[PDB]
Amino acid sequence: TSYVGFHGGLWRSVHIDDLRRSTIMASDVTKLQNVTISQLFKPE
């Protein structure tokens, strides 16, 4: 909160929460919002 933000001019403000890609969690949080924890383990 103590960081000044949306500088204009020749700058664009985008927010990347983690720089490194994770091969563990899927990168779409809504798919995780559909299912519950028991439904993560459903086999083929």
Residues near 27 by beta carbon (within 8 Å), at least 6 away in sequence:
21
C-alpha span between 39 and 9 (Å, rounded): 47
Residues near 6 by beta carbon (within 8 Å), at least 6 away in sequence:
13
Q: Look up residue 9 and give its two tokens.
A: 């001019």
Q: How far is CA 26 from the centre of its chain?
A: 9
Tell me, letter by letter, the H, E, C secondary structure of the chain.
Answer: CCCCCCCCCCCCCCCCCCCCCCCCCCCCHHHHHHCCHHHHHCCC
Method: cryo-EM
The dihedral over CA atoms of 3, 17, 15, 1, expressed in degrees to the nearest 10, equals -20
Question: Which of 31, 25, 35, 4 lies closest to 17 in space, CA to CA?
Answer: 25
Residue 9 Rama label (left phi>0; alpha psi -120 to 50; beta): left
